[PDB]
């Protein structure tokens, strides 16, 4: 503050940009994500808010959003922007296929994503994106697992396992706890078990506020039902 | 105080009658080292003292080639020298190209001005930051031009800008009549400038690192020297 | 906050954007909509801000069609609701020239909410002040309630409420409403929500706006004051 | 339509030696059957020991000289004086020809110079700017006469290679005699630019001017 | 002091010469998916076979305002057209209405044109890229 | 004080007023000057205070009364600079006018068009309003003899006779009463001299001062022309 | 009150007095510029401009306080100097615009007007500011000799006889003085000898100072604008000094 | 505003066409940003009908037409040690000699090869492009372009200008790991077509006899191209393999 | 004589009363706040390496890159704000590659560097007269090393003020001052390439928090021949047990 965080091409005396910094705790107020990848496959984790009793749930949208049929994606922060930044992925990943014949790999879909949300940071008439994001997906004609972040300033990052949002914190420190780089669950239900006890720590009422997405090579893109994540809630809580 | 309420942009005038930020632009000029111009009836001559960030590093170039028949010398803002030189080297192209004609000095002085003027009363830029002294050889014969970036430019036997660039410019004053008449003799007039920028010393010494010369004449196309074209000049 | 609601592209240091905030509080000002989704339709009622008995109440201030399916009720500023309005209906036309085909009701509800979005991100402009509920048909999901709000968020529901009354008349309909309700029993319920959350001391028809969208195909009706007061009469209030 | 083309048909000769280049031209310019000027030189010195050529419509090739010309000052502006290699100034030349792909120039071009190893180089090239290192090559008018003289005279028969400066002089101003005994358009003048390590040398010689 | 517009014809192409369509995988190339064309429409065949009152028509007030002002630069001075050009750069600059296409009145009002009409003004007239945020995005420059 | 946004721009204050507006109204009175115009049977005339203090000005310099076009005459009451701006704008519309329509532009038409051009200025941020009151006068081919005035605010309206300045309370009331005795709109003249004599003295007996020959100007609008008059036409008129 | 608070921070904005105060404070900044003056005789124009002494390093003959924009027009200016070159680089383009259009000399007025014109068109926006200078120019033409003041605002007025910068008020009332004394008119020469004399009252403190004299006449340079030349300058000062 | 005024100031620059930004960078007034350009710019005649006065007055004396790419014959096959290219080297005879031995073959980097065919200038001026395009990509993805990519590239580029009057016929080969050996033939027509075996220029009826396996040897490859192209008359030869392309000659 | 607020430290385009612009240092506190990074040249080749800080064990240690490749005579590293330095990088290959292209020839280091610095200028006046592009100066220094035929091996330092020098040695980032400091020290002609790497691993090793390893540090280098390399972990992890050793 102290007059230095009212525009986005103002640096700090110590060199900060603060509204990038607010932008940031805009993010931190969504729900929370979950992005871990195993030997063979990548799972997203989402939170979801308890639905109204009079709320439908037939039509309401996901958390975890297909880009393409290899790439999938999922966000913290606010839900109405990332309806746009969808949309222009998926436009982005129809039009590279349309103009190299090839389709996108998981790298270049999250720079174009961060490019973005970089470029509505340039300009003290508009407003940047209050979004964090989680690509995930397996290159073309590749089995390597690729899970990647990309924030509103337009940085990304590749991580191994990763959280955004509320109580991401405690997320983090139970992945850094449970996971291990050099030896990581081989198989897709060790990942998906992992994924949900990191969601169980800051989840209140349990398996009907978790949303669990599984990618594999050769575009395999798997939503998995509330009866799957009901029987990994119930054996995690039984080995409890 | 009050002057901090007026000192916002360029299109501001304070209650008084004053335009602070051409003053800001005006005095970043000390910041920079200096640099030293003469002339006589048949050459000109530029002398510009460099300076290093650290031992690890190189000095920075002050003197700049704008034609062959035409140079100058910067002190102050770098962005804004590298600017006037390329748009100077842009005027000379375009007055070669297009009449087969060498760029007047004169005319080179009165673009630099016009383009100067502008972004000291419109909003959204700022004033240029950078004092030039251009040297050149032309029909007239030699010439020496002082520009200040409030939009200036003066013509002169001799001056000098920089810091501490007084005790030169006192020197070049005082011994007017002597360089004014070396005519068809180069080293003279060489060791003459050499003198008037290390009376502009402080705790200091000419070096072959940080010393740079420039010369401009009547068969003399503008030329620099640098390192050990200057050791018989220290 | 006072130093960071000037302006709808400024963050705050919290991460919260004052100007939107301000157009959702601007809706609790608006006159009460409640939408009902019957197992065999659906059911847009709303209570008119009348406060002169010289207004013409024959000649719709709250009920709008956007296509022979799809219907809307407004709570907010109209002349913003009419500009959106008339977007939609060309959104709509523009989908049955390029597809032969009626647009679906979820497409069209996702490119308001979009328009809407993109109105809190350019500083020249200022957030729309109106919500919307959305009553369609579709050959993909059947009938649909939706509402969008001056954000750019949209959410479907079953019963639904927005303006003045929004918690009173929410807790009522979880109170009384069925999966298995019928339209007639929709519209019994929609009309006692009203009248139980009427500031006003009766809830005459020239204060009511009704709408029906059901099957002999699929029709909408637009209620007229006379089938107001019939439907009055019956109901018991 | 109007016509934005003419002809001022003239003839040129470039040869690499083992450390020279010859690039020779007649210096005759004329109009359909009219002699314009007996002395209108086709061969210019573009700095840093390279020597250009242009032959066919005068205009487009004096407009492409120039532009070379420009190019080559603020190369050096740019990249401290650095000397500009014979080859990149071939990739220059069929950038500038081929920039102009639907509206091309009228010309043929020859450049000749030093390569980087002190040998002699010639480039030579098409209109549209595509281009080859050659030994020897004769444009124009009187091609089909000059290039005979110089294969019956020189092997590529006393080698090439072993030739000295005066010799292929000696070879340039009989072929070009020769040639101005048979054809109309070549007469008046003949000028030879010479390129070795030390510079540029200008020869001139008188030809037949009926 | 043009009549009829003059000087309409293109002098140099390139395959990026429409900045806003540039493909991202390929910066040089134009983005035919965004362009939303038909996707089989090359810039060269935009280079014939046109009408030729096209030109004429579409560049007509553009070239009598360029002599409204030469005009007025010749008999009032040089400060008259600055003035009408600085009106009209304010008024067009400062309107900013992404779901109307329809002329301002002040504009009308610079343009002496409150009670005219031409077919420009009765005849004033997809999956990918017309929304909002195109137009947002074309007006800052980002 | 306008106290807020207002004290720069044309925008609402809390009490729904423009105060910019209304301090261009109070900068239409910064030279001290009165202007007069009355109606004849064919003719129009307009009179206005000349005050030179200063003796190394130029008189002949001095004048606040242009000629738009052939008929018409206008007045200007405030600054110089907007007065010379507001006289090339008319002209260049009068001219456009004639140019686009094929007849010579009607005074109340043209006082129309610069109305419009202030209510731009009124409702533009970034435009100001230029601080002059205009008053066109002419004889029309069709109305006869007329004066119309236009002000800051946007607003016009034609008057059988009008004044203007810091002093336009005491003129306006004795045409008021004049008209009163007269029980007529115009003055019942067939020469513009008789009607030049008549505005003249009711100018001073308005200000209650004695005029020469140097301290007023003078217009003169026929069906043919509009006219200024000079020095020795002035002395004429007032010897009587 | 000369400052107008809370609305002096921006230009054209006017006061609740209806006042610019930003146009006021670049004729503040004029006020404090040197002293010029201008005087209209019988058939020309004379200015007359007081310097500072610079140092000798200065090339004599390439420093000239006093600008010509037309073989017929004179004109000095006091304030900002990139001002005041810009506003003479405009006028030369007028000048040279309207001979080209209409194979005559521009008149002093419709040259007047369109500096003015451009002048005024600076007080009509926040994006720029006024010109920080107070020019008086002159010269002859077809209908005699003409001389002119501009303002920050963009104000003109033809004088009889017209002063600038900070000894302005002296210099105003000897230009008074002379006038009074002089009802039927005055000569060139006599204006110049005057011309001094004014210069040199109004300088006097640090006493050291040059003068420049220029002239435009119809008897004298043939309707021409030319500087003073020794023999008639040094006749000046010796005047003024006497 | 003042920019307003500049534009309102003042003939001789507007008579030189310098007035406009394009005519000071081609001529290099303001520096040299023409040759920095990742998109060529190509000038057109500022008239109605740019395509017929191309034609005209490239179809009609002296040495200054356009130089025609050989129409000899070429041939391209994959099998599974890669890519074989062979090239009747024959080269012409006209007014000039030979320094070296003339390429048919662009080399577009160290991984690509394409075929001249139509027009020479355009196929080296764009091969040359082409490989620009690749380099960047490879700097950008950290990895070694696909022959699809670079095709569909070049497709697109000659595409955008069709009918403009360029004529080339090119073959991409290239071998990449996840795609194996690929060839593809792009034409100025704008077609793209993936292939096995193609034979292109006069004599492709009888070079096209290709005794073809997809478990011939390197050698057994060689010798059957060289068989080929002497059946259709020296023989230019390359083999491409996943490290590069290997040059023969023979 | 009254205290009050000072607000000239705001605009990128706003002089101090004594000609400074405050917006330009604090880029360069920004800049500061990078990790760190070293470039050693010597007449065998030139040597960068940068430090990887990671916040999370989870984070890809494989994936920070503040080593890149311009082109096969030219690498960088860089330090501070990173979508800043994408963009960079991005104009300086398709600078080097235009280069190629237009005249068939790799492009000089100090012409790259110059064409960086000139990119950096765009907050302001471009280097050519070009209008504005950016709000803001860049948040991100340079550090730029190349070999070509006119100048042998060259490192030069770039930074948002649109100046760039020419270093025997340099360091940025955090650890800057006490690793340039070192390097004021510890630098000569007559260094080897072994000699330069032990050197910016030790002088790393010396600035980090951390204790060093592959897996936190980074190295590359830059010779005629080979062209520009970065080194994989065993290399580098070898280079480090042999400084160990030596120490």
Same mark, same amino acid.
């Given at each position: ?240 | ?10 299109? #501001? ?164 009549? #002597? ?56 | ?237 | ?210 | ?142 | ?240 | ?149 501009? @303002? ?59 003068? @420049? ?30 | ?250 | ?247």
């Amino acid at each position: 503050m102290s007059g230095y965080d009212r525009a986005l091409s103002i640096f700090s005396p110590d060199g900060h940009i603060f509204q990038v910094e607010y932008a940031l705790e805009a993010v931190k107020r969504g729900t929370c994500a979950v992005g871990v990848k195993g030997k063979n496959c990548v799972v997203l984790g989402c939170e979801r808010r308890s639905t109204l009793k009079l709320q439908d749930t037939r039509i309401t949208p996901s958390k975890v959003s297909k880009i393409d049929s290899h790439v999938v994606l999922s966000f913290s922060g606010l839900n109405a922007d990332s309806r746009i930044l969808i949309e222009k992925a998926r436009v982005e990943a129809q039009s590279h296929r349309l103009t190299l014949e090839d389709p996108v790999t998981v790298e270049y879909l999250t720079r174009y994503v961060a490019g973005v949300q970089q470029r509505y940071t340039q300009s003290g008439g508009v407003r940047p994106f209050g979004v964090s994001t989680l690509i995930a997906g397996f290159d073309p004609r590749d089995d390597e697992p690729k899970l990647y972040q990309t924030e509103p300033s337009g940085i990304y990052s590749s991580w191994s396992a990763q959280t955004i949002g509320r109580n991401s914190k405690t997320v983090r420190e139970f992945l850094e706890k449970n996971y291990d780089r050099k030896e990581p669950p081989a198989t897709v239900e060790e990942c998906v078990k992992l994924t949900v006890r990191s969601l169980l720590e800051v989840v209140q009422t349990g398996a009907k506020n978790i949303e669990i997405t599984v990618v594999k090579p050769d575009s395999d893109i798997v939503a998995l039902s509330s009866e799957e994540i009901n029987q990994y809630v119930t054996q995690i809580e039984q080995e409890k | 105080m009050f002057r901090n309420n007026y000192d916002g942009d360029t299109v #501001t005038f304070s209650p008084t009658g004053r335009l602070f930020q051409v003053e800001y632009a005006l005095e970043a000029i000390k910041q920079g080292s200096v640099t030293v111009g003469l002339r006589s009836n048949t050459h000109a001559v530029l002398v510009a003292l460099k300076r290093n960030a650290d031992e690890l590093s190189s000095y920075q170039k002050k003197i700049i080639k704008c034609d062959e028949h035409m140079g100058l010398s910067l002190a102050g803002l770098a962005p804004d020298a590298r600017v006037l030189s390329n748009y100077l080297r842009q005027q000379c192209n375009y007055s070669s190209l297009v009449f087969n004609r060498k760029l007047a000095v004169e005319r080179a002085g009165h673009l630099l001005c016009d383009k100067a003027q502008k972004n000291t009363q419109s909003y959204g830029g700022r004033p240029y930051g950078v004092g030039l002294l251009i040297i050149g050889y032309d029909k007239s014969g030699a010439h020496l031009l002082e520009f200040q970036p409030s939009g200036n430019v003066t013509e002169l036997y001799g001056t000098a800008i920089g810091a501490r660039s007084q005790g030169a410019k006192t020197y070049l004053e005082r011994t007017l009549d #002597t360089f004014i008449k070396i005519d068809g003799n180069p080293d003279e007039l060489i060791k003459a400038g050499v003198e008037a920028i290390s009376q502009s010393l402080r705790d200091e010494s000419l070096t072959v690192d940080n010393l740079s010369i420039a010369i401009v004449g009547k068969d003399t196309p503008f030329t620099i020297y640098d390192g050990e074209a200057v050791a018989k000049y220290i | 906050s006072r130093r960071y609601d000037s302006r709808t592209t400024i963050f705050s240091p919290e991460g919260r954007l004052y100007q939107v905030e301000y157009a959702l509080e601007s809706i609790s000002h608006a006159g009460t909509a409640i939408g009902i989704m019957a197992s065999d339709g659906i059911v847009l009622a709303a209570e008119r801000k009348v406060t002169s008995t010289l207004l013409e109440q024959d000649t719709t201030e709250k009920l709008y069609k956007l296509n022979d399916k799809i219907a809307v009720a407004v709570a907010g500023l109209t002349a913003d609701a009419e500009i959106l309005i008339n977007t939609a209906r060309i959104h709509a036309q523009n989908y049955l020239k390029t597809y032969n085909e009626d647009i679906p009701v979820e497409i069209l509800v996702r490119r308001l909410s979009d328009i809407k979005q993109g109105y809190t991100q350019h500083g020249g402009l200022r957030p729309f002040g109106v919500s919307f509920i959305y009553a369609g048909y579709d050959d993909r999901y059947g009938y649909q309630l939706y509402t969008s709000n001056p954000s750019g968020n949209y959410t479907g529901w079953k019963a639904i409420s927005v303006g003045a009354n929004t918690s009173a008349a929410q807790t009522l309909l979880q109170m009384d409403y069925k999966d298995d309700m019928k339209v007639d029993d929709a519209i019994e319920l929609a009309l006692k929500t009203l009248s139980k959350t009427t500031d006003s001391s009766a809830l005459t028809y020239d204060r009511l706006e009704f709408a029906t969208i059901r099957k002999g195909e699929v029709y909408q009706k637009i209620f007229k004051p006379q089938e107001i007061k019939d439907i009055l009469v019956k109901t018991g209030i | 339509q109007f016509n934005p083309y003419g002809d001022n048909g003239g003839t040129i000769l470039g040869i690499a030696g083992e450390d020279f280049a010859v690039l020779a031209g007649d210096t005759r310019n004329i109009t359909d059957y009219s002699i314009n000027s007996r002395y209108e030189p086709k061969v210019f010195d573009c700095g840093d020991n390279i020597v250009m050529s242009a032959n066919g419509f005068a205009a487009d090739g004096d407009a492409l000289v120039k532009r070379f010309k420009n190019s080559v000052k603020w190369y050096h502006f740019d990249h401290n004086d650095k000397k500009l290699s014979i080859n990149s100034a071939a990739r220059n030349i069929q950038h500038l020809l081929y920039g102009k792909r639907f509206f091309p120039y009228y010309v043929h071009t020859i450049i000749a110079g030093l390569d980087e190893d002190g040998k002699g180089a010639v480039y030579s090239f098409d209109p549209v700017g595509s281009y080859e290192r050659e030994q020897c090559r004769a444009g124009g008018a009187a091609a089909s006469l000059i290039m005979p003289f110089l294969d019956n005279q020189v092997n590529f028969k006393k080698p090439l290679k072993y030739l000295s400066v005066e010799e292929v002089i000696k070879l340039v101003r009989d072929s070009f005699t020769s040639a101005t005994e048979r054809h109309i358009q070549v007469g008046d003048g003949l000028e030879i630019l010479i390129v070795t390590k030390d510079g540029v040398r200008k020869e001139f010689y008188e030809l037949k001017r009926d | 002091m043009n009549i009829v517009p003059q000087d309409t014809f293109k002098s140099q192409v390139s395959t990026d010469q429409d900045k806003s369509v540039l493909s991202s995988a390929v910066p040089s190339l134009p983005d035919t998916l965004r362009q939303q064309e038909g996707g089989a429409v090359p810039l060269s065949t935009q280079l014939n076979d046109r009408h030729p009152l096209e030109s004429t028509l579409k560049n007509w007030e553009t070239t009598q305002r360029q002599r409204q002002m030469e005009q007025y630069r010749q008999i009032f001075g040089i400060a008259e057209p600055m003035k009408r050009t600085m009106e009209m750069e304010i008024v067009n600059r400062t309107d900013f209405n992404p779901l109307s296409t329809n002329g301002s009145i002040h504009r009308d009002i610079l343009l002496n044109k409150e009670c005219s009409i031409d077919w420009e003004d009765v005849y004033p007239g997809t999956m990918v890229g017309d929304d909002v945020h195109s137009k947002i995005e074309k007006q800052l420059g980002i | 004080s306008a106290a807020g946004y207002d004290r720069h721009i044309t925008i609402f204050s809390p009490e729904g007023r423009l105060y910019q507006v209304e301090y261009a109204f109070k900068a239409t009175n910064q030279t001290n000057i009165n202007s007069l115009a009355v109606r004849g049977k064919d003719c129009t005339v307009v009179i206005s205070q000349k005050k030179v203090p200063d003796k190394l000005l130029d008189p002949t310099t001095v004048s606040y009364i242009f000629c738009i076009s052939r008929t018409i005459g206008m007045v200007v009451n405030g600054p110089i600079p907007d007065a010379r701006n507001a006289a090339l704008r008319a002209k260049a519309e009068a001219a456009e006018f004639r140019y686009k329509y094929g007849y010579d532009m009607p005074c109340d038409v043209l006082a129309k068009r610069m109305a419009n051009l202030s209510q731009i200025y009124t409702q533009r941020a970034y435009m100001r309003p230029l601080g002059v009151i205009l008053t066109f006068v002419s004889v029309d081919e069709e109305l006869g003899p007329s004066i119309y005035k236009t002000d800051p605010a946007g607003y016009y309206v034609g008057y059988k006779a009008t004044a203007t300045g810091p002093k336009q309370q005491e003129i306006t009331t004795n045409l008021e009463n004049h008209f009163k005795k007269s029980k007529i709109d115009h003055i019942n003249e067939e020469s513009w001299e008789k009607v030049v004599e008549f505005a003249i003295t009711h100018m001073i007996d308005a200000l209650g001062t004695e005029f020469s020959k140097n301290d007023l100007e003078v217009g003169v609008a026929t069906k043919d022309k509009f006219f200024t008059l000079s020095a020795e036409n002035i002395e004429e008129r007032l010897v009587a | 009150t000369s400052i107008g608070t809370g609305y002096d921070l921006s230009n054209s904005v006017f006061s609740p007095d209806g006042r610019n105060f930003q146009v006021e404070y670049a004729v503040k900044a004029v006020e404090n510029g040197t002293t010029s003056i201008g005087i209209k005789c019988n058939d020309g124009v004379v200015f007359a401009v007081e310097k500072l002494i610079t140092s000798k390093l200065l090339v004599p003959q390439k420093n000239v306080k006093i600008q010509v924009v037309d073989r017929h027009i004179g004109c000095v200016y006091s304030g900002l100097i990139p001002d005041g070159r810009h506003l003479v680089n405009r006028g030369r383009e007028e000048a040279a615009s309207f001979k080209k259009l209409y194979k005559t000399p521009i008149p002093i007025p419709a040259f007047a007007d369109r500096l003015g014109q451009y002048v005024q068109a600076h007080t009509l926006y926040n994006s720029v500011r006024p010109f920080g200078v107070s020019t008086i120019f002159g010269g002859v033409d077809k209908n005699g000799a003409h001389l002119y003041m501009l @303002e920050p605002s963009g104000s003109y007025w033809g004088y009889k006889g017209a002063a600038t910068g900070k000894g302005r008020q002296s210099a105003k009332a000897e230009l008074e003085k002379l006038v009074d004394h002089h009802p039927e008119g005055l000569s060139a020469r006599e204006a110049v000898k005057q011309a001094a004399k004014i210069i040199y009252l109004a300088h006097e403190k640090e006493k050291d100072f040059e003068l @420049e004299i220029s002239w435009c006449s119809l008897s004298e340079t043939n309707g021409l604008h030319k500087f003073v030349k020794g023999d008639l300058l040094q006749e000046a000062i010796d005047f003024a000094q006497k | 505003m003042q920019a307003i005024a500049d534009s309102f100031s003042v003939r001789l620059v507007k008579e030189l066409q310098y007035d406009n930004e394009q005519n000071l960078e081609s001529d290099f007034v303001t520096g040299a940003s023409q040759f920095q350009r990742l998109a060529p710019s190509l000038t057109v005649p500022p008239i109605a009908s740019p395509q017929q006065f191309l034609r005209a007055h490239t179809d009609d004396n002296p040495d200054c037409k356009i130089k025609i790419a050989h129409g000899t014959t070429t041939l391209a096959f994959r099998f599974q040690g890669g890519i074989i290219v062979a090239v009747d080297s024959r080269a012409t005879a006209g007014n000039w000699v030979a320094s070296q031995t003339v390429k048919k073959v662009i080399e577009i980097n160290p991984f690509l090869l394409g075929t001249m065919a139509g027009g020479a200038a355009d196929c080296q001026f764009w091969e040359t492009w082409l490989g620009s395009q690749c380099r960047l990509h490879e700097l950008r993805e950290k990895e070694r372009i696909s022959v699809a990519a670079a095709s569909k590239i070049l497709s697109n580029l000659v595409y955008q200008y069709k009918g403009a009057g360029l004529s080339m016929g090119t073959m991409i080969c290239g071998y990449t790991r996840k795609e194996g050996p690929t060839i593809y033939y792009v034409d100025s027509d704008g077609t793209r077509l993936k292939g096995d075996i193609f034979c292109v220029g006069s004599g492709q009826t009888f070079a096209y006899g290709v005794n073809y396996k997809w478990d011939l040897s390197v050698e057994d490859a060689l010798y059957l191209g060289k068989r080929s192209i002497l059946a259709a008359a020296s023989v230019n030869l390359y083999h491409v393999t996943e490290d590069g392309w290997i040059y023969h000659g023979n | 004589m009254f205290l009050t607020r000072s607000e000239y430290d705001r605009g990128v385009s706003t002089f101090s009363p004594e000609g400074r612009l405050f917006q330009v240092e604090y880029s360069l506190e920004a800049i500061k706040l990078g990790s760190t990074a070293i470039g050693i040249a010597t007449k065998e080749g030139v040597v960068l390496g940068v430090e990887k800080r990671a916040t999370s064990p989870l984070l890809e240690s494989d994936s920070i890159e503040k080593i890149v490749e311009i082109d096969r005579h030219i690498g960088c590293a860089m330090s501070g704000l990173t979508a800043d330095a994408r963009s960079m990088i991005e104009h300086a290959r398709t600078a080097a590659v235009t280069h190629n292209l237009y005249y068939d020839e790799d492009i000089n280091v100090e012409s790259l560097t110059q064409s960086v610095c000139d990119l950096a200028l765009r907050f302001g006046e471009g280097a050519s007269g070009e209008e504005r592009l950016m709000s803001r100066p860049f948040g991100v220094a340079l550090l730029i090393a190349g070999h070509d035929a006119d100048d042998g091996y060259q490192l030069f330092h770039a930074e948002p003020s649109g100046t760039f020098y020419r270093y025997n040695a340099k360091a940025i980032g955090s650890g800057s001052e006490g690793a340039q400091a070192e390097l004021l020290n510890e630098w000569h002609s007559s260094l080897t390439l072994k000699e330069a790497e032990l050197l910016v691993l030790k002088i790393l090793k010396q600035v980090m928090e951390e204790k060093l390893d592959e897996n936190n540090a980074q190295l590359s280098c830059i010779t005629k021949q080979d062209g520009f390399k970065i080194y994989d972990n065993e290399k580098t992890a070898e280079l480090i047990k042999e400084l160990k050793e030596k120490e």
